């Protein structure tokens, strides 16, 4: 006789209808147990507020018509079937934004009691509101909703193949070598209802991820740390020295190029910039302000009581002539010294507030590190 | 016997024609009620005047042939059917620019009285005349037309499923953390006639959106304002100093490279310009003016009638070897006649350019305030 | 009885063949009248030399088989048909470069005489040579040919639905806020021949467009003139002063920076360069020439007459008290060897000032000329 | 009589199925011998950890039904049959991230005893654990596992066409002009089981490559060594030098410049950054701390003995009116003659600067040479 | 009676197969004469070593079964037929990398004897071994191989339609308005056997091009010469002046901004870079080295090997009362450099040394430019 596999396929698929739900009593639904396994976090576009991932998607459902007695067909129980030749649920993501380029799995398994298995990988693109204020240490709670766009809960009830804990503790395949770590995958069933009698089933996966800030930190923050420190020792230089002026303008140019390119390295979002950029701009502000005051004082030494009060509140005759010129600096010196001292004690104030900004920067970095270490 | 579902599918889709419009009396049209919900705003390319969004698109219509008696089929009333096995209208947006990647919904529901439902999402790409003049604070009355590319109004009359108000305030599904914010969507129906015998139906969901200016603002205004700051202290540098000149040239090339990057950073408009760049370039103008004037007076101190008729008209408009080395000690301070001939001009011009720079940034601030009031009022 | 619409679809589409040209006498061609409207101008890549456009391509032709008596089928004259169930011509563009993502229109009308109408949008990616020589005010005569890639004129002759005047005057559908305006669309029929004995039909559409240079003008031409004027005033500075040299080298830096954005903002064709950059680099050339001559004279300052002959040929067309006074008068007198070259340093400075001003003048002149030529179209 | 080629095709493709695994006894699997060749290494995304390649994939298996007697069919022993007219295995790669654009090869050769040959190219995009620590001279062991997504080892037992030595030796087709090289293609077989009843056969291909570091070498190391020599002559300057500090800030400018150039040029996975930037930042750290030391000296030579005692311990561990106008002159000397002996400790401190900086640049050069040697050791 | 154009389709396409090679004796191959015309060159990825083109590709072969007597069909000798209803060869390119987006020509012509013509526009992408050493004036001879991925010469022997001279000379359709100029397209037939009994026929088309550098000249080469020349006159200066130092630093900033454009406009390739960037590296190196030398001489100006210094200039020459005392102070004030005169000497001649090597690099750059121009103009 003929092979049992061919005979079984002919016996089943003949008089089978793709479009009809594989049920006898229409009043019942047909449930779908699924499973989600995270492979990789491909891209995180903070500006577009989207995510790009790759998963292994498993699916199960029962078809009342794909049933047989194994005894006739040579005790065969399992069978491979083309997925294009059977009914399939239109399960799909609500957070979906753009068609992920993924292959097609033509085949599916079919047991001798209607059960079906549809394993397939899945690239996908989804929307996710990303909080980038703690930019290097930012941690996300993106979702992956699962439901049918059309069919209601009376036709399709989403379920799970496994326990939720077994899903959260599943990291056998995930690659930890990207910029992004994976902490868990927390599922949560829910029912969803546009209006009464329009109830819809739903399943959700609270995907959680964490950023690895080491490259970003060492290549962005520490440059700024060294920059703030060299600004500090520039404040340490003697007041109103052109050496200090060259110092400050060199640092100004450095800050210029630094902020320019790190703006390209720093993806900001609708919130604005993150806190690191805030510290950057304010330390730049203090640098340019101290530069301005230095050049103000060196302008003044070139030959008021109001702000004086304000700031102290804020807490041989020819040779006699050429020796009057020996004394010319002292003659200008009383005014020169008063102006220089007021300018210098302003430099100390700028130094103080720069130190405050640096300390707050360090403290914020420590706090962000700890919250990152919530792991 | 067999299941009622299979029997019914056999009865409904055998001897059915997907290509034929599902009507008995051809003189009738077939109406299509729709609905639109904005899921999110993805991208707004101010350069090419194009928009990209994601919506949920419901549409309803009737088929005279998809009708059955529920009692014959186990009192069943509704059923899913594949899209590919039934007639579908060629509804299409008028202002498409390129097809967007949207997944396919194979199935559609069908009731026992010809009714049909087809729910699906749509990544769409549409042209929109954008006004970049209030670049960070703009509001944009883009549109989403809906009609058939081919079918007349006598075959297809577009309709609205819901009320216009419920469609306006349907902010249930949206994402707010994105760059943009959606103020409302206002539907409107009209007819369209390229010529007689081409009367076509049309909807118009006037999608409205609002920007969020912060990451542009703090990232870009404050470096510009710092350029303004270092320019005013460059005005305050000593007039005689040629370190002032190098300083101000550094600022001039700074304004230049800033114009460069904001050309390579922000999407420069097609028509008009944002006034922010206008304030920036007039700041550059004041910079180069002060530079020219300080080097001018520098070479001077190294035409008093010019000076004095000019200030006159301005006033009208306001309406032994020991004695020798002592002579040398004076010679240290002896060119001050020709120095003071132009040093008052130096000081007064420095203060004047300073003042008008401050006035320019005042107008900058006022423009920012007015745009803020508008952006809030919307 | 049944609806006449379904009866008619069964009458026509049965025993119909998509592949066969819908003709009874093969010797006659199948005319295809078309019409084109430019919805918008999306992008034009001056680096890669392509053009992106969206059009509402219309199309009309005849099928001998799609013919019926309306009276039998309930006085029905018109109906829709799926486009994928009938013969269609292989109309296609010869300037085509890349398959354009565009939606499909699955349906078409058919009248009772055999007529057909296929309305559909169409995105294009076509090659167009571009003159970037007048980069700010450039104007293009891009083309859009239409023809069968395979079929001859003896099978498919192209035609127009409307008159060419109505076409060129057609600007009803357009997005006017983009950079590129539209002036007209000039068609011109033509017959084509890869080789004799195989004659091909064509129907061109000389798309013409024009650029809005306003933001280009602001971002480019005003800072150019600003650097020009800055150098102009810098030239006034005294020759020996090294701050003049610092001025001129830093401004040369600005010149190179502007040239950098020029090379960048213009990723233009390597076949031809605009003249804005030309005027700018000769400006830079005069600046560096001034700089070099300045360093030369500055070195000559402190401590020869062949030089003077040559520029003339050009012009043809108590000991210690005494020591104190000597110190004073020698710090005064070191200018003597300086004057001997400052005499000609001033001359060089002013000649270069003159020629620099001439170059800037010609720059403004050319800019106004191109403004005029722009407005002329 | 009809053709042979024509009436073999009709004999075979009639009553043949595409969903049925081509077997008589279902209990046996159907084996699939393969063979892989690397045509080119197109792109290596160091940031996203992605590999883009292009291969010449071969594929062999057997069909119990596609068999015949050549003697009937004019001694025909091979035939071109379309790929979409017979069963095909769902052999794919686990490491896919996207789908690669590769054209469909419709035809496949078939012998008169079930054997099938399906050659085809496969552009493919996969992930790989990249190692950037040796950023100039990095080498990678990327993998391409081949396995059926669904079918188990009881249905599909993957195997290999040739011997693995033949595969590793095979470099007949490769573009050596790319940024990368090809060292071998090392196969390996494995059974894969997430759990019992999921025994999945597979075959690996450890694609190994190597970078050509010349461009990166000249564009990173040479300016690094330049600035290093500049630091050398930097500390060579004795103390109390305004030249020294002006120089050192010039070096600070250059180091900030090339730090940002470093950030620009190299992309980098954030799991770990390379030693090159480490040497950069630490030598810049040395620059700034010695700058601070110079500043402290400059204020000490201008105008703290516990420092001296602790430093001596540290060093043990290391082991008349004319007269008045002439005084108006001589203060020019007394302004110099004012000196402090803190400078002794200050510039005995600079002895440690020489040591640490030469040590740092030595470590840099030594590790660089080591990376070169390891690159050549491949 | 019905139209012959319909009877013909129903007479041929019935009982026809799309998979069966249209042959009556399997032993013979299906010869496929082809032809290639270059419409345009689109982009050249020197970075990734990839080419992309657009081609008007044609095919000519025979079908044993698509035959008829025109007399029975109203003397009809030709016919259009859907391409997706007949056998087709699996012609494909070996240099192919990724699927290019080309439209589909659903129709093909057919003659009464068996000939089949299938014209189509190919939009193509291929890998090529690109040489950027003469980056402004380079010429890359890329290949476009054509062969069947599966069949052998025993089933498909590829041939050519026109003569190779007609192929080379045919540069009419190519637009000469882009960046890259075309020179010729040389065909070459070949047989291939990586292993035995697999005689995969093929055919190559050596596409050969040339870059138009006139933009790049004014963009990069001319201003680089200006940078070189300002640095020349900088090295015309004495070591004493710190103005020299500030000058070198401003030129250093100029090359600093050159770095960003170099990465952006010169297409940096990891395997190799042009001689141009090498000369620029040399000029930058000599600039910073002269900066180091003049600051060394600035040190030497500052009051604290001199006989060593004179050994080295020999190496060169081989290679080549209050008032009384304050008046004495005036003398030594104008002569306080008394020893640093000796070091200003060597600083000056060292400025001349660095000046020699710098102008040498500059003129070598110029000469190499001229040589590249001559080679370019030669071919």
From Swiss-Prot, chain A:
GO molecular function: identical protein binding; ligand-gated monoatomic ion channel activity involved in regulation of presynaptic membrane potential; serotonin binding; serotonin-gated monoatomic cation channel activity
Transmembrane segments: 213-239, 245-263, 274-292, 353-372
Disulfide bonds: 128-142
Pfam families: Neur_chan_LBD (PF02931), Neur_chan_memb (PF02932)
One GO term of the biological process aspect: serotonin receptor signaling pathway
Positions of region (HA-stretch): 316-347
Keywords per UniProt: Cell membrane, Disulfide bond, Glycoprotein, Ion channel, Ion transport, Ligand-gated ion channel, Membrane, Postsynaptic cell membrane, Receptor, Signal, Synapse, Transmembrane, Transmembrane helix, Transport
PROSITE patterns for the chain: NEUROTR_ION_CHANNEL
Family under the similarity heading: Belongs to the ligand-gated ion channel (TC 1.A.9) family. 5-hydroxytryptamine receptor (TC 1.A.9.2) subfamily. HTR3A sub-subfamily.
Quaternary structure (record): Forms homopentameric as well as heteropentameric serotonin-activated cation-selective channel complexes with HTR3B or HTR3C or HTR3D or HTR3E. The homomeric complex is functional but exhibits low conductance with modified voltage dependence, and decreased agonist and antagonist affinity. Heteropentameric complexes display properties which resemble that of neuronal serotonin-activated channels in vivo. Interacts with RIC3.
Protein name as catalogued: 5-hydroxytryptamine receptor 3A
From Swiss-Prot, chain B:
Domain notes: The HA-stretch region of HTR3A seems to be responsible for the low conductance of HTR3A homomers compared to that of HTR3A/HTR3B heteromers.
GO cellular-component term (any): cleavage furrow
Family the UniProt entry places it in: Belongs to the ligand-gated ion channel (TC 1.A.9) family. 5-hydroxytryptamine receptor (TC 1.A.9.2) subfamily. HTR3A sub-subfamily.
Topology with respect to the bilayer: Multi-pass membrane protein
Intrachain disulfide bonds: 128-142
Glycosylated sites: 75, 141, 157
Bilayer-crossing regions: 213-239, 245-263, 274-292, 356-375
Record's keyword terms, sorted: Cell membrane, Disulfide bond, Glycoprotein, Ion channel, Ion transport, Ligand-gated ion channel, Membrane, Postsynaptic cell membrane, Receptor, Signal, Synapse, Transmembrane, Transmembrane helix, Transport
Spans annotated as HA-stretch: 320-350
Topological domain spans for side Cytoplasmic: 240-244
Location in the cell: Postsynaptic cell membrane; Cell membrane
Source taxon at top rank: Eukaryota
Organism whose genome encodes this protein: Mus musculus
Reactions accelerated catalytically: Na(+)(in) = Na(+)(out); K(+)(in) = K(+)(out); Ca(2+)(in) = Ca(2+)(out); Mg(2+)(in) = Mg(2+)(out)
Name of the protein in question: 5-hydroxytryptamine receptor 3A
Alphabetical list of Gene3D superfamilies matching this protein: Neurotransmitter-gated ion-channel ligand-binding domain (2.70.170.10), Neurotransmitter-gated ion-channel transmembrane domain (1.20.58.390)
């Amino acid at each position: 006789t003929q092979p049992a596999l061919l005979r079984l396929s002919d016996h089943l698929l003949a008089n089978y209808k793709k479009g009809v739900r594989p049920v006898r009593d229409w009043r019942k639904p047909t449930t779908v147990s699924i499973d989600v396994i995270m492979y990789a976090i491909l891209n995180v576009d903070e500006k577009n507020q989207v995510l790009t991932t790759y998963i292994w998607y498993r699916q199960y459902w029962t078809d009342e018509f794909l049933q047989w007695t194994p005894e006739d067909f040579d005790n065969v129980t399992k069978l491979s079937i083309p997925t294009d030749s059977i009914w399939v649920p239109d399960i799909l993501i609500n957070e979906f934004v753009d068609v992920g380029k993924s292959p097609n799995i033509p085949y599916v398994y079919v047991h001798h009691r209607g059960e079906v298995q549809n394993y397939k990988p899945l690239q996908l693109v989804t929307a996710c509101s990303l909080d980038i204020y703690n930019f290097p240490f930012d941690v996300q709670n993106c979702s992956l909703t699962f439901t049918s766009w059309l069919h209601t809960i009376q036709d399709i009830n989403i379920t799970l193949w496994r326990s939720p804990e077994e899903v959260r503790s599943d990291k056998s395949i995930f690659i930890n070598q990207g910029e992004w770590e994976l902490l868990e995958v927390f599922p949560q069933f829910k029912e969803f209802s546009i209006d009464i009698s329009n109830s819809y089933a739903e399943m959700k996966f609270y995907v959680i991820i964490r950023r690895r800030p080491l490259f970003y930190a060492v290549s962005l923050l520490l440059p700024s740390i060294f920059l703030m420190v060299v600004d500090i020792v520039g404040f340490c230089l003697p007041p109103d020295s052109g050496e200090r002026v060259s110092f400050k303008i060199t640092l100004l140019l450095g800050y210029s190029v630094f902020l320019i390119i790190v703006s390209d390295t720093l993806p900001a979002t609708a919130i604005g910039t993150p806190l690191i950029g805030v510290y950057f701009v304010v330390c730049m502000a203090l640098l340019v302000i101290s530069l301005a005051e230095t050049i103000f004082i060196v302008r003044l030494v070139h030959k008021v009581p109001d702000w004086l009060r304000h700031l102290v509140l804020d807490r041989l005759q020819e040779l006699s002539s050429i020796r009057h010129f020996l004394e010319k600096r002292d003659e200008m010196r009383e005014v020169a010294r008063d102006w220089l001292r007021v300018g210098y004690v302003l430099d100390r104030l700028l130094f103080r507030i720069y130190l405050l900004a640096v300390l707050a920067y360090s403290i914020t970095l420590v706090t962000l590190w700890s919250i990152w270490h919530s792991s």
